[PDB]
Design a protein around this ligand. Structure first.
Ligand SMILES: Cc1ncc(COP(=O)(O)O)c(/C=N/[C@@H](CO)C(=O)O)c1O
Ligand SMILES: Cc1ncc(COP(=O)(O)O)c(/C=N/[C@@H](CO)C(=O)O)c1O
Ligand SMILES: Cc1ncc(COP(=O)(O)O)c(/C=N/[C@@H](CO)C(=O)O)c1O
Ligand SMILES: Cc1ncc(COP(=O)(O)O)c(/C=N/[C@@H](CO)C(=O)O)c1O
Lengths: 381, 381, 381, 381
């Protein structure tokens, strides 16, 4: 079936017993067994029909064999790194979500894991960073918040040639835009809190593995650590995923128009956007991404107050998060990336004045009218 | 106010703005800020009114400074142990939940943490286990499934004398029965999937710390690892907790009667129960526990089949989990503790014939009649 | 099985397919049919597993044939009265909930139904009100808010002798106190928003009938009018219902003490309470009720301001509704019964000075202490 | 703001106090009052923040003054008809949903209301039916299931000239397609179970009045009869509504392709579709509808078994209901319209073999392949 049909009917989308057109929400913590060990479900944390349903869906969408739903994107990441042990070495991208930087520095390094940050746009630099004790490569593409694009297929071949896990954080793209397991990657994960839920009303994470052997290891850690996605939220997450494609098209059309409009403003000095033809990422972006994503970051002229700008928007919402129906806007350095020290932020290209815009699905004319309220307030229209 | 009043009115139990006699379920993933950094709430994972309310309530019930709600009891444990680093040594009780055994051996030991199992009923053995790298003592009391009682106040003073964190799993008792923070312990935690929820319909974990400094450390890990309790399920947990005292009184009266009845039966060779006066635990049980719990384990004569016994009950339910309104029953070696290898199980007192019974709140007469069906099926009435 | 056991296991309390210890929440609106006319469920309004479970349970608890769940007690009453046609005449008790009065006067009378209000304590006056076009007798017992007791068995015999439907609103008592169908009544109904839900967090109605024929007519109207209880709230209602006996014991015990205490206060001139032995209803109360309920109304000395009294309570909550874990208090003339005109209020016994107290399950000591802050604020303790 | 922007941000879409980007779910049945009569909310049936939010939203979308949410479409209709009295006469269309027919015949006629069914496409017949006791005109447009289009503006002018209420069931269109209040109508109502919820997972109804005087009457009846939409489902409805415009566009695009495809199949003898240019309703549809709807009904050649056809579809689901993300199909005479007697069905144009297809948003190639499987099974490809 085609992708839009899989959103509506893929995974488990029905209750086989009743024919119900929605997967029932199994709040039950436990399950009566008639003879020990022959039940399909035993304990809600270990598995239950509602969570299994959204888990089957994301596996279908990402073209993986197994999916796993977690209480948050961060918990999904924490579980995946629980594959590694003291003395393992990991290669990480140098533009990541501030919370992933926090997990690495404040938790995983205490467990004896060691990390080297690399610009994964430079595959020479990636291969140079590989050591005999290296075990995996972890990167987001496009990145949070600079939207750097990494050649996934190239990273995956590099990874295969050295017996490394390749791990792609696919949050920003979504399986509608990018299916990294189709490019050789071992593990893909999402913060479902963004596009996959899409309604600004659910926190969760998703992991999909290509092979069943790696699925058995993730599933074992999922049950062992217990950072599971609750049944109500699993159900809400699936419901929102059903409109993923319809939402994404609106998202992407609106972003294309926002980019063009942002470039028509002299108040804007720099724009980060995978669809910029001047951007040297642009060719690998058009090859591996179905569209250019709905994130855009930009700087204003050095005299211009970003706080003043974002605080004078009226449709666009000043908030953390992204991928919601409503446009969200943020200053990474004061908000989602405050967890990264300022000196490190600035070495890796996150200026204190950078603005991150998650383009919603509102009417584009209303969005542009709103953005000009922001330019007007810094004398820049 | 008194405990029962606190269940209904404590923590946050009301919406201040409207007067709503229930805390609203905040499904929102994010919050509009009017200025950056002035919001009370910024991102659902970091905090939201709904999860905050149940966190406040368990903190009041346990007489602590701060509460923290997690996707499950296992996720609470995993977060607590992320306080520690590679090379840290931890003393654990030798009778723990099978999954806590699982997490320690399969995950925590890969992070460079080391562990020594000890009968925490023998305080000299505990002190003998303390090494220069030791960082904490972790134990359940009563234990799962043998219901061994440990002198909490003694363990705390031992831990304080050597700069250790004392961590008590209070799942089997609940704050109605046992308030470890009142006996000097540093951290108390729960699988909320038992008595606190009480209705067999929610998976969750709760952690309470005495001091605000330890609270800031748990809170930071909770946000950084992200195994939060979702909003809907936090609300459901708080709702169940409101009837904790009424449920607990009923649980406890049925368990008293179940204990008397199981001793009148010659088919039962051994009974594990804190209210047993033949138990050497009995004196400490009576001193630190308000009631003897509603868990009971027992063995049948070596001829008799426990699998047959449990499969012939019709009110008591054969399943995992405990602490629900419905009586639950289980064979640990085939179920909740099959994650511990057989050699270590029998070395530590868990025979394969052992039956664990979670005494519910049904009419006691309907419960004894049901147990008589199981005895009759192995010719032993 | 005994009542407490039925609460936990009666009606439908588990999912037969998986063994889930909770009935799953079927959010689906519709159900795939394989062959037309062969599905168990077709459309969620007509029926679904979640609502069916709570309907089955209340039917067990009330000793009836069929249960029906509505969006509120008002909607339940509206559907029951849709049994009747223009020209039909109904005898009603003269102390009914203000909203039942409003339905009758504002809606049902426009449908050509006619009504005589009668003190159903006086059976001779009930018989004198029976007319050639009379079809039914409808009353609450105990009444809202004067807690008048009517002889249920006698009213049924009277109704049977003239081919009338007898309808008892059982909200204040609950099946724990009073099972009207056991006394010959044709239809029993509840505002489940009170004791049955128990947690101040669900709006709902319930109807149970004795015979299947009357059940077919109520069910037909339920589906035709469509005032159904949604699945989420059906599941929440059933979960509340499981603790009904535990909660009721507590409610009843506190209300006993509250009554004793309110008689010791000279500021209280009059007390309405079915457990009052100076009450002429007391004997029939003791014969048809299992406990005297947990409502109490009372008046202060004419100088004393009831608004002052209730506004100075700190544990008792000033609000509408009743039957919650937490104590609620209210002034009917100003609140739940302001829908009745003041002249009709006074002729039927509801003074503007009247205070109605819904006794919760807080510790009785904290409740008596709270009540004396009320008395203190009008200089009367 | 534009329609697509109002979906995301109109009505009440935020929590004012916390800035939550989703309206909180107020499960509370009641609200503490500080001084009597000064609360914004007093009782959840009478109103609560969550239901108020979706009520504001639908009022904005339909360009009306006030919105009202009910437990189902049928309950919304039942409440609107409680505006009328015994002796009142109502004019109805002759093609209505089977349940509206049932409500009229089995309930409202018992209340002394009288009805005359009329082809509302024939304005002369409408005028001919107006009597001195007539008070309203009620019709769906498009109708269920023949999709008959009525000139709404003309019907409103007719009703204005005789001081009648015009009531339009707008379920099949959705406010994205059709806004009857902009054409002079007094009341618009929906079964929100269709396109508004959009996800096959909510039952509810909506009513919107143009004037505030009519709003006060509807609101008074809503509270008095109590057929409210519960808080959980109110919130789900609103979340579904947020994607209404994105879903509708996909709906309508698929329906145009399905219509073309069905017209090229000789097995199809008659098609009912508002966008058929040979349909005499085409011009009025083009003029008053923003698109032709996503419903299609059709008949096959007299030899061909419609049951065989629909039972061989694999993406299209045989089930009641409509307006869902997934395609639904149905045979009205055996299903949604079985409540109308067969003789009356055939008099008014519903043949026993009519098929009613609710076009979903699956990929159109997958839908066309699926329809082929149905035609193949009747030897008609
Ligand atoms: C690329 C990526 N991976 C993982 C996560 C973490 O996932 P949860 O938020 O725990 O669900 C995030 C979160 N980022 C949001 C929230 O701060 C934001 O930047 O605004 C992310 O952007
Ligand atoms: C003393 C203790 N601590 C932690 C946990 C782990 O808590 P979650 O299940 O993750 O909520 C449990 C679980 N025990 C149940 C579950 O199988 C059981 O044994 O039947 C426990 O008993
Ligand atoms: C004896 C009785 N029957 C029916 C109803 C109507 O029940 P819903 O509220 O529609 O569920 C009520 C409600 N009374 C509450 C609420 O005002 C109260 O008096 O405080 C009632 O007390
Ligand atoms: C034009 C119209 N108005 C009102 C209703 C009644 O609305 P609820 O179902 O009570 O929400 C319906 C329902 N019809 C659906 C379900 O049978 C169907 O035909 O498949 C309707 O189609």
């Amino acid at each position: 079936m085609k992708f839009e049909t899989q959103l509506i009917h893929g995974g488990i989308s029905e209750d086989a017993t009743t024919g119900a057109t929605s997967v029932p929400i199994y709040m039950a913590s436990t399950f009566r067994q008639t003879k020990i060990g022959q039940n399909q479900y035993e304990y809600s944390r270990t598995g239950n029909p509602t969570r299994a349903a959204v888990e089957a869906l994301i596996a279908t969408l990402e073209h993986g064999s197994a999916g796993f739903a977690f209480a948050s994107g961060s918990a999904a990441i924490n579980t995946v790194f629980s594959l590694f042990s003291a003395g393992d070495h990991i290669i990480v991208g140098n533009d990541v979500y501030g919370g992933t930087f926090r997990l690495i520095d404040a938790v995983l390094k205490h467990f004896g894991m060691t990390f080297t940050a690399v610009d994964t746009r430079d595959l020479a630099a990636v291969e140079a960073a590989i050591t005999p004790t290296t075990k995996a490569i972890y990167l987001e593409t496009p990145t949070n918040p600079l939207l750097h694009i990494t050649d996934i297929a190239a990273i995956a071949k590099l990874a295969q040639a050295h017996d490394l896990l390749s791990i792609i954080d696919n949050t920003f793209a979504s399986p509608y835009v990018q299916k990294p397991l189709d490019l050789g990657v071992d593990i893909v994960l999402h913060s479902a809190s963004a596009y996959l839920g899409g309604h600004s009303d659910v926190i969760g994470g998703l992991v999909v593995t290509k092979t069943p052997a790696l699925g058995e290891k993730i599933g074992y850690l999922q049950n062992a650590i217990g950072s599971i996605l609750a049944p109500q939220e699993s159900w809400l997450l699936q419901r929102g995923m059903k409109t993923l494609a319809l939402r994404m098209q609106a998202h992407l059309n609106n972003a294309a128009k926002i980019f063009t409009y942002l470039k028509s403003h002299p108040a804007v000095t720099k724009i980060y956007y995978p669809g910029d033809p001047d951007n040297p990422d642009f060719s690998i972006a058009k090859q591996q991404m179905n569209g250019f994503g709905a994130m855009i970051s930009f700087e204003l002229q050095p005299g211009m107050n970003p706080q003043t700008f974002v605080e004078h928007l009226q449709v666009i919402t000043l908030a953390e998060s992204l991928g919601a129906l409503e446009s969200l806007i943020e200053i990474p350095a004061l908000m989602t990336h405050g967890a990264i020290p300022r000196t490190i932020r600035l070495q890796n290209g996150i200026k204190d004045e950078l603005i991150r815009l998650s383009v919603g699905v509102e009417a584009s004319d209303d969005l542009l009218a709103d953005l000009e309220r922001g330019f007007a307030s810094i004398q820049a229209d």
